[model samples]
Target: GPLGSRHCLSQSHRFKGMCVSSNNCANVCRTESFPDGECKSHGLERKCFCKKVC
Candidate 1:
Protein backbone atom coordinates (compact mmCIF):
# COMPACT_ATOMS: atom_id res chain seq x y z
CA GLY A 1 0.00 0.00 0.00
CA PRO A 2 1.10 3.56 -0.69
CA LEU A 3 1.58 4.68 2.86
CA GLY A 4 2.76 8.15 1.90
CA SER A 5 -0.32 9.63 0.26
CA ARG A 6 -2.70 7.63 2.39
CA HIS A 7 -0.98 8.66 5.60
CA CYS A 8 -0.71 12.29 4.57
CA LEU A 9 -4.46 12.77 4.29
CA SER A 10 -5.19 10.71 7.33
CA GLN A 11 -2.74 12.66 9.44
CA SER A 12 -4.16 15.94 8.23
CA HIS A 13 -7.72 15.08 9.17
CA ARG A 14 -6.60 13.57 12.46
CA PHE A 15 -4.81 16.74 13.50
CA LYS A 16 -7.68 18.89 12.33
CA GLY A 17 -10.05 17.16 14.66
CA MET A 18 -7.51 16.71 17.45
CA CYS A 19 -4.98 19.49 17.60
CA VAL A 20 -4.02 22.05 20.21
CA SER A 21 -5.58 24.73 18.03
CA SER A 22 -8.88 22.86 17.92
CA ASN A 23 -9.05 22.71 21.72
CA ASN A 24 -11.04 19.53 21.25
CA CYS A 25 -7.67 17.96 20.63
CA ALA A 26 -5.15 19.06 23.21
CA ASN A 27 -1.57 19.64 22.14
CA VAL A 28 -0.13 16.27 22.71
CA CYS A 29 3.00 17.28 20.93
CA ARG A 30 4.55 19.54 23.51
CA THR A 31 8.07 20.10 24.83
CA GLU A 32 7.84 19.04 28.47
CA SER A 33 5.93 15.74 28.45
CA PHE A 34 7.46 14.35 25.30
CA PRO A 35 10.89 15.94 24.92
CA ASP A 36 11.49 13.95 21.76
CA GLY A 37 8.32 15.45 20.30
CA GLU A 38 5.09 17.19 21.36
CA CYS A 39 2.23 14.82 22.16
CA LYS A 40 -0.89 14.67 24.33
CA SER A 41 -4.20 12.90 24.76
CA HIS A 42 -6.43 11.57 27.47
CA GLY A 43 -7.19 8.31 25.64
CA LEU A 44 -6.73 7.82 21.89
CA GLU A 45 -4.48 10.79 21.17
CA ARG A 46 -1.64 9.09 22.99
CA LYS A 47 -1.89 6.34 20.37
CA CYS A 48 -2.37 8.81 17.49
CA PHE A 49 1.18 8.94 16.21
CA CYS A 50 1.75 10.29 12.70
CA LYS A 51 3.73 7.34 11.47
CA LYS A 52 1.62 4.80 13.26
CA VAL A 53 -1.83 6.25 12.59
CA CYS A 54 -0.95 7.40 9.15
Candidate 2:
Protein backbone atom coordinates (compact mmCIF):
# COMPACT_ATOMS: atom_id res chain seq x y z
CA GLY A 1 0.00 0.00 0.00
CA PRO A 2 1.87 3.04 1.35
CA LEU A 3 5.62 2.57 1.02
CA GLY A 4 5.32 -1.18 1.42
CA SER A 5 4.14 -1.97 4.94
CA ARG A 6 5.28 0.38 7.68
CA HIS A 7 6.14 -0.90 11.14
CA CYS A 8 6.73 0.83 14.47
CA LEU A 9 8.76 0.28 17.63
CA SER A 10 8.00 2.14 20.84
CA GLN A 11 10.11 3.54 23.67
CA SER A 12 13.70 2.76 22.85
CA HIS A 13 15.72 2.37 26.06
CA ARG A 14 18.65 4.06 24.37
CA PHE A 15 16.56 7.19 24.04
CA LYS A 16 16.39 9.17 27.24
CA GLY A 17 14.38 12.20 28.40
CA MET A 18 11.61 13.85 26.38
CA CYS A 19 11.65 13.44 22.61
CA VAL A 20 12.13 16.94 21.20
CA SER A 21 13.90 16.12 17.93
CA SER A 22 13.22 13.51 15.28
CA ASN A 23 16.85 13.61 14.16
CA ASN A 24 17.98 12.42 17.58
CA CYS A 25 15.39 9.65 17.67
CA ALA A 26 16.22 8.57 14.12
CA ASN A 27 19.90 8.39 14.98
CA VAL A 28 19.12 6.00 17.79
CA CYS A 29 16.70 3.97 15.68
CA ARG A 30 19.43 3.47 13.09
CA THR A 31 21.29 1.36 15.63
CA GLU A 32 18.25 -0.89 15.81
CA SER A 33 18.03 -1.12 12.00
CA PHE A 34 15.17 1.36 11.62
CA PRO A 35 15.79 3.96 8.91
CA ASP A 36 13.81 6.70 10.62
CA GLY A 37 11.94 7.68 13.80
CA GLU A 38 9.69 10.29 15.34
CA CYS A 39 8.28 11.46 18.64
CA LYS A 40 4.65 10.53 19.11
CA SER A 41 2.34 11.93 21.73
CA HIS A 42 0.75 9.38 24.02
CA GLY A 43 -1.69 10.86 26.53
CA LEU A 44 0.54 13.46 28.25
CA GLU A 45 4.10 12.50 27.36
CA ARG A 46 5.93 12.08 24.08
CA LYS A 47 7.46 8.75 23.14
CA CYS A 48 9.93 7.64 20.50
CA PHE A 49 8.47 5.64 17.61
CA CYS A 50 10.95 3.92 15.32
CA LYS A 51 9.86 3.44 11.73
CA LYS A 52 10.81 0.60 9.40
CA VAL A 53 9.64 -1.02 6.17
CA CYS A 54 8.43 -4.55 6.52
Question: For every model in order, what is the number of clashing pairs?
Answer: 7, 0
Tens-place lDDT digits, model 1, residues 1-54:
555533221132234344454222224332112212223465665423332223
Per-residue lDDT tens digits for candidate 2, residues 13-39, read 577878889889999888877788888
Q: How many angstroms is residue 44 displaced in model 2 relative to the true structure, after the best TM-score fit?
A: 1.4
**How does each model score on lDDT?**
0.33, 0.79
| lDDT at position 24, candidate 2 | 91
Task: Please report how far candidate 2 places residue 40 from its true position, in Å.
Answer: 0.4
Per-residue lDDT, model 2, residue 25, is 91
Misplaced by over 4 Å in model 2 are 1-9
Question: What TM-score fits each model?
Answer: 0.16, 0.73
What are the runs in model 1 whose C-alpha is more than 4 Å off?
1-4, 8-54
Leading candidate by lDDT: 2
Q: How accurate is candidate 1 locally (lDDT)?
A: 0.33
